Amino acid sequence: QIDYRDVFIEFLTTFKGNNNQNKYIERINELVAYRKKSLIIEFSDVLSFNENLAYEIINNTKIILPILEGALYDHILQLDPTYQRDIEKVHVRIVGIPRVIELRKIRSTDIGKLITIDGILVKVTPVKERIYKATYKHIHPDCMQEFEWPEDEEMPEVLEMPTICPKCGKPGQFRLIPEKTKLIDWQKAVIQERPEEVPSGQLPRQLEIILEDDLVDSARPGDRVKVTGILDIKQDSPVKRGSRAVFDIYMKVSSIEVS
Amino acid sequence: QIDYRDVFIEFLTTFKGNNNQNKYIERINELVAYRKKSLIIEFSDVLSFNENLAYEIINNTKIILPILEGALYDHILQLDPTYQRDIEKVHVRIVGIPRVIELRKIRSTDIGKLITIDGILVKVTPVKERIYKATYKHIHPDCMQEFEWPEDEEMPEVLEMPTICPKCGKPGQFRLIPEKTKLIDWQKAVIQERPEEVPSGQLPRQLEIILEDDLVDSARPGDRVKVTGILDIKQDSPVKRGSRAVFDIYMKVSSIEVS
Amino acid sequence: QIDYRDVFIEFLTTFKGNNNQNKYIERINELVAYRKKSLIIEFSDVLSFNENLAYEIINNTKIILPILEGALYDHILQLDPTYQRDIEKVHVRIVGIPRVIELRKIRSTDIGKLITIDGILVKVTPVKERIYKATYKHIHPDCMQEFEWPEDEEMPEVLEMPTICPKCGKPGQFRLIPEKTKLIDWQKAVIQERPEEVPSGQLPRQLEIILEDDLVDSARPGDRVKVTGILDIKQDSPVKRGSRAVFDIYMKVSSIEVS
Amino acid sequence: QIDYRDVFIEFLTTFKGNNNQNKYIERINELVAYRKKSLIIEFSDVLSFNENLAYEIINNTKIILPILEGALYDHILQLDPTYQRDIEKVHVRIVGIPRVIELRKIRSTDIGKLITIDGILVKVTPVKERIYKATYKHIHPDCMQEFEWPEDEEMPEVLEMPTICPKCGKPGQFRLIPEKTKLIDWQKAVIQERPEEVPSGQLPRQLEIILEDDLVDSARPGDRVKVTGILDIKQDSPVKRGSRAVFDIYMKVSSIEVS
Amino acid sequence: QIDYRDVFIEFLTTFKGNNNQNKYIERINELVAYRKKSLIIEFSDVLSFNENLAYEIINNTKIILPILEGALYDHILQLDPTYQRDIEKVHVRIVGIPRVIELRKIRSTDIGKLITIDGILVKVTPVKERIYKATYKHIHPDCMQEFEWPEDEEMPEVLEMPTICPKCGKPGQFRLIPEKTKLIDWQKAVIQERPEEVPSGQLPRQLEIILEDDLVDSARPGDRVKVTGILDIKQDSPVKRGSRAVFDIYMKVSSIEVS
Amino acid sequence: QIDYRDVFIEFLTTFKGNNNQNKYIERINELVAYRKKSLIIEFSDVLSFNENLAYEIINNTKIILPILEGALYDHILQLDPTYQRDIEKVHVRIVGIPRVIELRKIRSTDIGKLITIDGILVKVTPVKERIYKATYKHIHPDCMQEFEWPEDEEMPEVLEMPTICPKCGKPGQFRLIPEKTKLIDWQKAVIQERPEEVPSGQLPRQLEIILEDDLVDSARPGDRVKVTGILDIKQDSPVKRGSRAVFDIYMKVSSIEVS
Ligand SMILES: [Zn+2]
Ligand SMILES: [Zn+2]
Ligand SMILES: [Zn+2]
Ligand SMILES: [Zn+2]
Ligand SMILES: [Zn+2]
Ligand SMILES: [Zn+2]
């Protein structure tokens, strides 16, 4: 009904700020100049410029975010096509949202909303790679062809491969082709309740968080962090019956500020 | 034959109490004002006002409780429709029943009855989420559709997924869609015999209990608690032959009073 | 050929005892009055009244015992039908048999006979529940019906579920319905050779024993016990090939006297 | 061609011995009187009475031994049919054979011959039970019948169950019926090189041995034993490809003398 | 469009160097004389002689390198056909590239490019062998033929064997024939951040590197090394669903200089 | 083209040696007299008498060795037919070849050649047995027959069993029949770099070697040995995809000289 791309682009270009300057235009400039790949937009700024947009961001997130990103990417190549063939996705990273929840108080009604948590980062894995699109090769004498996997969809956390080959239509052996697989940087990090928040006698609760892409290694153990992201439930052996039915919560991280 | 809703509603509205006041009317007021989502009704009060109702509560529980909850919900929206779109279920939490069983004395004739156990809470997990309705997506080129799973029925503790797709009627791969899955807050807690009750020379017995929704984190290790709920047998690998046949008992907790 | 029910019933009603009283009639009275669910009959008494019956008891046990139990149940309901709908099986617990075997001396020819072992109880699990009759639900759009499982037969220690559904005849997913499942109280305990019986230099041998129903918690670690029951071999992953073929012995306990 | 039963029976009845007495007649008498279930025959005695027989024993063993046993059993029931319904197999246990091999020196050419080893017993398991004939029950609505398993053959160490039901001829679920399964007492024991035989600098080699039936618990850790039996190769996960191909040697024990 | 073989060959033959000598011609001479099997070419030299080629090397690597290698092999056999039947592939090892990345700074956009890392070798496995071409035998009464496996393609790190036999066309058991298998020398080593580069408080990150063929054993633990090669993701149980989707990075090493 | 048997036989009979004696004729005499079953021929002697033969031995080994063994066996039975029915194969064990490789220097160009390694034996397993021909029995009511397995071929290190029964041609369950299985004596031994050869600062490398038949227990931990044999790659889980592709090297030992 109403194009949020336009409003977003207008927002970045028009929004004044504190000293009648052009925050965001300036920010995007620093972004192109350094081939960094994320734009940090301050929430209160959006709401101020437009509440319809602010609303979407908090409540729609999953869809709108990629729309806004797609728009930003376009805007950038329009300023510097050289950015292409270096960076291919951009990331709109929302910060400073009113939605601050103490870690202990997270409940069911918070899954799927964009929220913020304040804690101490106590653990981070080394940087690893997640597949977001695979290439398989159908090992079968009559096919032997390659194809991108989850077609028009991203690979789920769990990793799946086709039953039936979409090039020949027959079942069989499929081999992953890593050199043709698209990867995204990935890091698991554990955050815990700040000491001040821990009811006496009790041990601090933790929350697994996932940092991807340029978010990776953006803070270290001991740091105090505001992490902003969307909560979800995490899986290892799903689709298998056996038992479970009970899930841990983790945050897919959208933005992070340190100390 | 006899509408318990009416009697329950009448009960809440007519029952006087100790000071010729209207306990329950007052309670429900405090419930709306604070958007809390449980009503605590004292058992002895019910029995007093009506023994037919009391009986049902202890012996029918599984069905009747939701009847009473449905009635309560109705009564509340009738006072304040704003309660809608904040809370959608209410939980009627019964307290103070005459049915107090010493943990060590629990036997098979007790499974399925609403009972009460007094003990010391020695362990609590952090809060997790239990699926009570999933959405799967049939990964199959010919379908690729979504559906709520256990249809007209809640998900078992164990987690199952269909063999045959209710949308296309064919078998295959099913993927869980968490963003569309209904979740309820969940916590396992271990409760143990009160020292006064442990026969000398022997080790205290323990009992796993499950706290769901707003019961979650309502007490902490070291607290003395009266937990009221329904006993059941707990599973990890069921439907699987191999061995077992022997099950642990746990309490599905209905209400909890602290220290 | 010869009805043991009659003889048993006659035995309980006629057998005099030490003071020309009616032990057994008296015992059964105490049984009804207290809703206890086991009758203890002294072996030497039986043999005395009838050797044919005594013989069966020791050597036929597996079948005859339930005959005798069936008979006792009938007799009881004939005195007080109120016993129904409280207790539904009875338990004839035989005591003081001449067949006392040293734990270390048990051999294959002993499996399946009613025997007695004298030892020190060293471990007891808490009380769990065994399934003796399940209810499954055939998860299938076309059926979705319930049925009691092992039909006209008890559940084996191992837990099985049907291949083919006896309501619709087709195969598929079956889900256990605990609230409709029959349960029996269950306790594993370990018993070990009396120090007096352990040859010097060597470690005491042990024997797993199972206590069901009202035998549960009838003795504690450190107690000296005479357990009377039937030996059998114990299973965890059977029907599976792989290896095994070698089994542990355990006693299914019929009666127990402490210290 | 030549009936070894006759010769064996004649041997036991005729063989004089040292003081013109009837060793063996005497031995078998002590056997019936005590319901013991093994006859110890001295090798040198056999060879002396008949070398054709002696030869068979050492070289044919596997078959001839059961022939000799079958003959002995017959001979015994002929003296005392009461022995029936107590003992059903007997065991001819050969002792004092010329074939003494040092444990370290066992090689391929010794597998399948009856040999003797002298060592120190360093380990024995508790007594367990091996299945030598199973009873399965075909769990299938159309059959539901029982049958003895390996038909006209003993169960291999490994434990197998039928693919196709020999009562109905269809495949499916088969459940073991323990109460109807024939068992044999079983004990694994480890024997090692005597210190005097151990080349200096090197650690003692061991040999797993299996003791069945009345051989069980016939010696304890620390004992010096001459064990006489047939060597074989031992399996856990056989029939499965994967790897292995390399096997340990164990002795199926035929007789044992202590210290 | 433009033959890099010619340019490469021209490069090696024409490129002068520092003293108007013919570095490369000289290098290749030393290569033939000693039956060494790798030519080290200095990057800055290439760029200088031709930037189009330099570009390919850094950015195309995966394809171009084998082109260049093929070309070098031809050139060599043209000077000394005796080199055949000793060495069959050559290895063009590129050194001194401008693309030096800090180990901790590696990201997804780096996978697949030829890069250099500077670190401390902390671990090396012994030398093992990798299969690059297998020979299987189709164990089948009707075939029983041999064939080289991945046809016209190298063996993936993971090892696969055909579904369908390319000699008979039918499926079945395939057995590896090592004596007919092509092997390459292989060594896993771990490399870690230089102390100078490890931010205070934090633990050094590490990187798995693989050394093949004549690179094997070319450095030892404690050595400071500049490794140049291509990053890739590493696999152990891939093609299997279950979970993962998350991968470690390792470098497939093209050249290495010590301390 | 040229019969090596003749040359070998001539070699053994004509070759003089150091004192114009007949080394080898003498050796073979000592072989018959003691029913030992290996002949040790010194390499340099062969080369001296005939270089064509020497060449074959080093480079053809796999075939030629058994040719030479067959010839030797013939020659022996011709001197003493009594050697038959004691020994049925002879093993020609070559010693003192010029091909001595330092353990650390072993590379892929060495696999498949007969080589020599000098080292310290640090570990030996006890003696075990390797199948070189199995007998399976097709467990199937319609067959139930026995057959030698790998037909006209030795069992791979890995152990396989047929998919289709060569007796009836149908698939199913196969059971190994050890009493009818051919076995060869087997010992794994670990050999390590001589201290003099270990580069300072680094850890000694090791090499698994396999001793079969009469080589078994021919040396003990701490012995310095020259082992001569053929290198190969070793397997545990092969034919299985998953990963690997990387293999350890081991020596299949042909001869061993101690200290
Ligand atoms: Zn295909
Ligand atoms: Zn579908
Ligand atoms: Zn059904
Ligand atoms: Zn059947
Ligand atoms: Zn084929
Ligand atoms: Zn067959």
Q: Got the DSSP string for A79-129?
A: T-GGGTTT-S---EEEE--S-B--GGG--GGGTTSEEEEEEEEEEEPPPEE
Give φ, ψ of F27 to 5 degrees: -55, -50
The first and second tokens of residue C75, run together, are: 């007799």
**Orientation of helix D65-77 relative to helix D4-14, angle to 10°:** 60
Q: Which of C62, C160, C205 sits opposite D126 (nearest CB)?
A: C205
The first and second tokens of residue D64, run together, are: 């001839």
β partners of residue F114: F230
Q: Which of F126, F129, F160 sits opposite D241 (nearest CB)?
A: F160
Overall resolution, Å? 2.8
Give φ, ψ of C81 to 5 degrees: -55, -10
Contact B/A (≥3 CB pairs under 8 Å): yes
The Cα C53–Cα E98 span in angstroms is 99
Give the ligand whose atoms come closest to the C-alpha of residue C145.
3
Domains of chain D: 1-99 (3.30.1640.10), 100-132+181-259 (2.40.50.140), 133-180 (2.20.28.10)
Does any CB of chain D come closer than 8 Å to the CB of residue F149?
Answer: no
The Cα A25–Cα D171 span in angstroms is 74
Does any CB of chain F come closer than 8 Å to the CB of residue D233?
Answer: yes
User: Residue F154: closest CA among chain D residues belongs to which residue?
Assistant: D245
Q: Estimate the share of chain A in helix, then strand, then coil, as percent rounded to the nearest 5.
A: 25, 30, 40
The first and second tokens of residue B230, run together, are: 């329904």
Give the ligand whose atoms come closest to the C-alpha of residue F143.
6
The Cα D226–Cα F239 span in angstroms is 45
Burial of D32 (0-12, 13-18, 19+ CB in 10 A): middle
Shortest CA distance to D175 belongs to which of B247, C154, C66?
C154
Shortest CA distance to B61 belongs to which of B37, B32, B87, B93?
B93
Determination technique for this entry:
X-ray
Q: Residues with Cβ within 5 Å of ion ligand 5?
A: E 138, 143, 165, 167-168
In Å, what is the CA distance from C86 to each residue of B52, B126, B230, C73, C222? 22, 41, 20, 12, 33
- Return all residues near D53 (Cβ < 8 A) that are at least 6 apart: D4, D7, D8, D11, D46
CB A12 within 8 A of CB A25: yes
**Orientation of helix C51-59 relative to helix C4-14, angle to 10°:** 120
Contacts of F232 in chain E (CB under 8 A): 178-179
Shortest CA distance to B124 belongs to which of B225, B203, B36?
B225
DSSP letter for each residue of F113-175? SEEEEEEEEEEEPPPEEEEEE-EEEEE-TT---EEESSTTSPPPTT----SB-TTT--B-EEE
Q: Residues with Cβ within 5 Å of ion ligand 4?
A: D 138, 143, 165, 167-168
- Return all residues near E151 (Cβ < 8 A) that are at least 6 apart: E166
The Cα D187–Cα E14 span in angstroms is 82
The Cα A40–Cα A22 span in angstroms is 14
Shortest CA distance to A178 belongs to which of E158, C54, D15?
E158
| Radius of gyration for chain B, computed over Cα atoms and rounded to the nearest angstrom | 21
CB D158 within 8 A of CB D238: yes
DSSP letter for each residue of B48-97? HH-HHHHHHHHHTTTTTHHHHHHHHHHHHHTT-GGGTTT-S---EEEE--
The Cα D6–Cα C185 span in angstroms is 59
CB F248 within 8 A of CB E128: yes
Q: Which of B128, B155, B160 sits opposite A248 (nearest CB)?
A: B128
| Radius of gyration for chain D, computed over Cα atoms and rounded to the nearest angstrom | 21
Shortest CA distance to A134 belongs to which of A117, A118, A151, A120?
A151
The Cα B170–Cα B162 span in angstroms is 10
In Å, what is the CA distance from E181 to each residue of B94, E148, E168, E210? 75, 8, 20, 21
How far does the centroid of ligand 5 lie from the alpha carbon of residue E146, in Å? Answer: 8
Establish how many alpha carbons lie within 13 A of residue F181's alpha carbon, considering only the half-sphere containing its beta carbon: 29
The residue type of A94 is I
Does any CB of chain B come closer than 8 Å to the CB of residue C175?
Answer: yes
Does any CB of chain A come closer than 8 Å to the CB of residue B126?
Answer: yes
Give φ, ψ of B249 to 5 degrees: -95, 145
The Cα C256–Cα C189 span in angstroms is 12
CB D183 within 8 A of CB C247: yes
The Cα E207–Cα F47 span in angstroms is 51
Distance, in angstroms, between E193 CA and closest chain A CA? 13
Contacts of F236 in chain D (CB under 8 A): 242-243
| Radius of gyration for chain F, computed over Cα atoms and rounded to the nearest angstrom | 21
Contacts of F156 in chain D (CB under 8 A): 245
Distance, in angstroms, between D129 CA and closest chain C CA? 5
Shortest CA distance to F209 belongs to which of F186, F193, F190?
F190
What b-and-e string marks burial along F43-81, b requiring 16 or more CB atoms within 10 Å of the CB? bebbbebbeebbebbbeebeebbebbbebbbebbeeeee
Does any CB of chain B come closer than 8 Å to the CB of residue A176?
Answer: no
The Cα B198–Cα B202 span in angstroms is 7
Distance, in angstroms, between A221 CA and closest chain B CA? 22
Check CB contact under 8 Å for E160 and F241: yes
Shortest CA distance to F150 belongs to which of F182, F118, F102?
F182
The Cα A28–Cα A35 span in angstroms is 10
H or E segment to which residue A13 belongs: helix A4-14
Shortest CA distance to A95 belongs to which of A38, A148, A135?
A38
Give the ligand whose atoms come closest to the C-alpha of residue F146.
6
The region that residue C245 occupies, defined by phi over 0 for left and psi between -120 and 50 for alpha, beta otherwise, is left
Q: Which of C106, C109, C112 sits opposite D179 (nearest CB)?
A: C112
How far does the centroid of ligand 3 lie from the alpha carbon of residue C172, in Å? Answer: 8
Check CB contact under 8 Å for E109 and A86: yes
Give φ, ψ of E207 to 5 degrees: -145, 130
In Å, what is the CA distance from E191 to each residue of A168, E118, E210, E221, F223? 43, 9, 10, 9, 37
- Return all residues near B121 (Cβ < 8 A) that are at least 6 apart: B189, B190, B191, B219, B220, B221, B222, B223, B224, B225
Q: Which of D164, D205, D238 sits opposite F176 (nearest CB)?
A: D238
Does any CB of chain F come closer than 8 Å to the CB of residue E154?
Answer: no
CB D231 within 8 A of CB D210: no
The first and second tokens of residue C218, run together, are: 């009838």
- Return all residues near D24 (Cβ < 8 A) that are at least 6 apart: D11, D12, D13, D15, D17, D39, D41
